[PDB]
Amino acid sequence: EDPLYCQAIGCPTLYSEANLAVSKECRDQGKLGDDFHRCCEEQCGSTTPASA
C-alpha cells in the first residue's frame, strides 16, 4: 500500500535511487517503532572513513 522508506536530514531523499538500498535495510529490521531513526542516521549514505 504505502512503502515505508527513510527521509532523514542528510541521508538520500525519499524517491532517489540510493534511498531504496539504505531504506530497505531499516524497513526490514523491526516494523514500526524506534529503528528507523537510529538505522537511518547510522546507515545514512556517505560514510566517512575513520577507524575508531
TrEMBL record:
Residues 3-47 form the Phytotoxin PcF domain. Disulfide bonds join C6-C40, C11-C44, C26-C39. Keywords: Signal. This is Phytotoxic protein PcF. It comes from Phytophthora cactorum. The lineage of its organism: Eukaryota, Sar, Stramenopiles, Oomycota, Peronosporomycetes.
